[PDB]
Ligand binder design. Structure first.
Ligand SMILES: Nc1ncnc2c1ncn2[C@@H]1O[C@H](COP(=O)(O)OP(=O)(O)O)[C@@H](O)[C@H]1O
Ligand SMILES: O=C(O)C1=C[C@]2(O)C=CCO[C@H](C1)[C@@H]2O
Length: 169
Protein backbone atom coordinates (compact mmCIF):
# COMPACT_ATOMS: atom_id res chain seq x y z
CA UNK A 1 0.00 0.00 0.00
CA UNK A 2 2.00 2.97 -1.18
CA UNK A 3 2.08 6.03 1.02
CA UNK A 4 1.37 7.93 -2.23
CA UNK A 5 0.82 7.31 -5.93
CA UNK A 6 1.90 10.04 -8.33
CA UNK A 7 0.05 10.50 -11.58
CA UNK A 8 0.57 13.01 -14.38
CA UNK A 9 1.69 13.53 -17.94
CA UNK A 10 5.36 13.27 -18.77
CA UNK A 11 7.07 16.46 -17.75
CA UNK A 12 4.75 16.95 -14.70
CA UNK A 13 7.69 15.99 -12.42
CA UNK A 14 6.94 12.43 -11.32
CA UNK A 15 10.57 11.40 -10.95
CA UNK A 16 11.75 14.80 -9.62
CA UNK A 17 8.92 15.02 -7.09
CA UNK A 18 8.75 11.27 -6.45
CA UNK A 19 12.43 11.16 -5.40
CA UNK A 20 12.22 14.19 -3.11
CA UNK A 21 8.88 12.91 -1.79
CA UNK A 22 10.13 9.37 -1.09
CA UNK A 23 13.27 10.62 0.80
CA UNK A 24 11.09 12.95 2.86
CA UNK A 25 8.80 10.06 3.85
CA UNK A 26 11.89 7.87 4.32
CA UNK A 27 10.82 5.21 1.76
CA UNK A 28 11.80 3.95 -1.73
CA UNK A 29 10.58 5.28 -5.08
CA UNK A 30 9.04 2.87 -7.64
CA UNK A 31 8.43 3.98 -11.22
CA UNK A 32 6.20 1.54 -13.12
CA UNK A 33 7.95 2.48 -16.37
CA UNK A 34 11.23 1.13 -14.96
CA UNK A 35 9.36 -1.78 -13.37
CA UNK A 36 7.99 -2.65 -16.86
CA UNK A 37 11.54 -2.62 -18.27
CA UNK A 38 12.82 -4.77 -15.37
CA UNK A 39 9.94 -7.26 -15.71
CA UNK A 40 10.34 -7.71 -19.43
CA UNK A 41 14.00 -7.08 -20.06
CA UNK A 42 12.80 -4.80 -22.91
CA UNK A 43 12.80 -1.05 -23.42
CA UNK A 44 9.50 0.80 -23.45
CA UNK A 45 10.14 1.97 -26.97
CA UNK A 46 10.74 -1.64 -28.16
CA UNK A 47 7.39 -2.83 -26.76
CA UNK A 48 5.45 0.00 -28.43
CA UNK A 49 7.32 -0.36 -31.72
CA UNK A 50 7.21 -4.14 -31.86
CA UNK A 51 4.07 -5.32 -29.91
CA UNK A 52 1.78 -2.26 -30.05
CA UNK A 53 0.41 0.06 -27.35
CA UNK A 54 -2.52 -2.23 -26.52
CA UNK A 55 0.00 -4.95 -25.49
CA UNK A 56 2.04 -2.29 -23.60
CA UNK A 57 -1.07 -1.26 -21.61
CA UNK A 58 -1.62 -4.87 -20.58
CA UNK A 59 1.90 -5.35 -19.16
CA UNK A 60 1.54 -1.93 -17.53
CA UNK A 61 -1.74 -2.77 -15.94
CA UNK A 62 -0.41 -5.99 -14.49
CA UNK A 63 2.76 -4.15 -13.24
CA UNK A 64 0.73 -1.42 -11.67
CA UNK A 65 -1.52 -3.87 -9.82
CA UNK A 66 1.56 -5.73 -8.63
CA UNK A 67 3.13 -2.43 -7.41
CA UNK A 68 -0.08 -1.26 -5.67
CA UNK A 69 -0.17 -4.61 -3.78
CA UNK A 70 3.59 -4.79 -3.00
CA UNK A 71 5.09 -1.35 -2.67
CA UNK A 72 5.04 0.60 0.59
CA UNK A 73 6.82 3.73 -0.62
CA UNK A 74 6.07 6.25 -3.37
CA UNK A 75 4.80 4.86 -6.67
CA UNK A 76 4.80 6.90 -9.85
CA UNK A 77 2.69 5.64 -12.75
CA UNK A 78 3.59 6.14 -16.37
CA UNK A 79 1.69 8.95 -18.06
CA UNK A 80 -0.95 6.78 -19.79
CA UNK A 81 -1.64 4.18 -17.12
CA UNK A 82 -4.86 5.99 -16.19
CA UNK A 83 -6.29 5.25 -19.62
CA UNK A 84 -6.59 1.58 -18.64
CA UNK A 85 -9.90 1.21 -16.73
CA UNK A 86 -8.56 -1.64 -14.62
CA UNK A 87 -5.75 0.69 -13.49
CA UNK A 88 -8.37 3.23 -12.45
CA UNK A 89 -10.27 0.59 -10.42
CA UNK A 90 -7.09 -0.70 -8.72
CA UNK A 91 -6.31 2.87 -7.71
CA UNK A 92 -9.50 3.04 -5.61
CA UNK A 93 -8.77 3.48 -1.95
CA UNK A 94 -5.19 4.71 -2.51
CA UNK A 95 -3.60 8.12 -1.88
CA UNK A 96 -3.35 9.60 -5.45
CA UNK A 97 -1.46 12.83 -6.17
CA UNK A 98 -2.14 14.36 -9.57
CA UNK A 99 0.84 16.50 -10.66
CA UNK A 100 -0.72 19.20 -12.82
CA UNK A 101 1.35 20.94 -15.47
CA UNK A 102 0.40 23.29 -18.35
CA UNK A 103 1.02 22.29 -21.95
CA UNK A 104 3.63 24.90 -22.55
CA UNK A 105 5.60 23.93 -19.50
CA UNK A 106 5.12 20.16 -20.00
CA UNK A 107 6.32 20.52 -23.59
CA UNK A 108 9.32 22.66 -22.52
CA UNK A 109 10.29 20.22 -19.85
CA UNK A 110 9.99 17.23 -22.24
CA UNK A 111 12.00 18.72 -25.16
CA UNK A 112 15.15 16.67 -24.88
CA UNK A 113 16.10 13.47 -26.64
CA UNK A 114 14.16 11.02 -24.49
CA UNK A 115 12.32 8.49 -26.68
CA UNK A 116 8.57 8.84 -26.25
CA UNK A 117 6.38 6.73 -28.55
CA UNK A 118 3.35 8.91 -27.98
CA UNK A 119 5.25 12.19 -27.91
CA UNK A 120 7.49 12.74 -30.89
CA UNK A 121 7.81 15.56 -33.42
CA UNK A 122 6.59 17.22 -35.57
CA UNK A 123 3.65 18.88 -33.77
CA UNK A 124 4.77 17.50 -30.38
CA UNK A 125 3.07 20.33 -28.58
CA UNK A 126 -0.18 19.63 -30.42
CA UNK A 127 0.17 15.96 -29.25
CA UNK A 128 0.74 16.98 -25.67
CA UNK A 129 -2.43 19.11 -25.66
CA UNK A 130 -4.33 16.10 -27.12
CA UNK A 131 -2.92 13.92 -24.26
CA UNK A 132 -4.00 16.56 -21.75
CA UNK A 133 -7.53 16.94 -23.13
CA UNK A 134 -7.93 13.18 -23.13
CA UNK A 135 -6.28 12.44 -19.75
CA UNK A 136 -6.84 15.44 -17.48
CA UNK A 137 -10.35 14.17 -16.59
CA UNK A 138 -8.99 10.71 -15.90
CA UNK A 139 -6.32 12.14 -13.55
CA UNK A 140 -8.95 14.25 -11.81
CA UNK A 141 -11.26 11.26 -11.33
CA UNK A 142 -8.60 9.08 -9.64
CA UNK A 143 -6.68 11.77 -7.72
CA UNK A 144 -7.23 12.26 -4.02
CA UNK A 145 -5.10 15.44 -4.20
CA UNK A 146 -4.12 17.88 -7.02
CA UNK A 147 -0.89 19.90 -7.08
CA UNK A 148 0.16 22.61 -9.55
CA UNK A 149 3.77 21.90 -10.48
CA UNK A 150 3.92 24.78 -12.96
CA UNK A 151 5.88 27.47 -11.20
CA UNK A 152 6.73 25.66 -8.03
CA UNK A 153 10.40 24.84 -7.65
CA UNK A 154 10.26 21.15 -6.64
CA UNK A 155 10.96 21.37 -2.91
CA UNK A 156 7.95 23.68 -2.49
CA UNK A 157 5.81 21.16 -4.45
CA UNK A 158 6.93 18.45 -2.04
CA UNK A 159 6.29 20.63 1.02
CA UNK A 160 2.78 21.28 -0.10
CA UNK A 161 2.25 17.52 -0.64
CA UNK A 162 3.52 16.61 2.84
CA UNK A 163 1.39 19.09 4.70
CA UNK A 164 -1.62 18.04 2.68
CA UNK A 165 -0.99 14.34 3.28
CA UNK A 166 -0.85 15.03 7.03
CA UNK A 167 -4.04 17.01 7.49
CA UNK A 168 -7.66 16.06 6.77
CA UNK A 169 -9.60 17.38 3.78
N1 LIG B 1 8.80 21.52 -10.13
C1 LIG B 1 9.66 21.57 -11.18
N2 LIG B 1 10.23 22.73 -11.63
C2 LIG B 1 11.09 22.80 -12.66
N3 LIG B 1 11.46 21.72 -13.34
C3 LIG B 1 10.97 20.51 -13.00
C4 LIG B 1 10.02 20.34 -11.89
N4 LIG B 1 9.71 19.03 -11.80
C5 LIG B 1 10.41 18.41 -12.79
N5 LIG B 1 11.15 19.31 -13.48
C6 LIG B 1 12.03 19.09 -14.65
O1 LIG B 1 11.24 18.67 -15.75
C7 LIG B 1 11.85 17.56 -16.41
C8 LIG B 1 10.94 16.34 -16.38
O2 LIG B 1 11.05 15.75 -15.10
P1 LIG B 1 10.39 14.36 -14.65
O3 LIG B 1 10.39 14.51 -13.16
O4 LIG B 1 10.98 13.11 -15.25
O5 LIG B 1 8.85 14.40 -15.20
P2 LIG B 1 8.05 13.01 -15.44
O6 LIG B 1 8.87 12.07 -14.61
O7 LIG B 1 6.61 13.24 -14.99
O8 LIG B 1 8.13 12.80 -16.91
C9 LIG B 1 13.18 17.33 -15.71
O9 LIG B 1 14.18 17.96 -16.50
C10 LIG B 1 13.05 18.03 -14.38
O10 LIG B 1 14.22 18.71 -13.94
O1 LIG C 1 2.10 9.14 -21.79
C1 LIG C 1 2.31 7.95 -22.11
O2 LIG C 1 1.38 7.26 -22.69
C2 LIG C 1 3.52 7.33 -21.74
C3 LIG C 1 4.51 8.00 -20.96
C4 LIG C 1 5.69 7.36 -20.44
O3 LIG C 1 5.55 7.35 -19.00
C5 LIG C 1 6.85 8.03 -20.80
C6 LIG C 1 7.73 7.65 -21.82
C7 LIG C 1 7.51 6.57 -22.71
O4 LIG C 1 6.10 6.44 -23.08
C8 LIG C 1 5.27 5.64 -22.18
C9 LIG C 1 3.73 6.03 -22.27
C10 LIG C 1 5.73 5.80 -20.77
O5 LIG C 1 4.82 5.04 -19.89
Amino acid sequence: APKAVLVGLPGSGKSTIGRRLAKALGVGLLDTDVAIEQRTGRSIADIFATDGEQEFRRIEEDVVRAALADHDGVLSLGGGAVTSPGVRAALAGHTVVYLEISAAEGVRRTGGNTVRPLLAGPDRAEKYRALMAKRAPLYRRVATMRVDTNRRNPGAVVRHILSRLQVPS
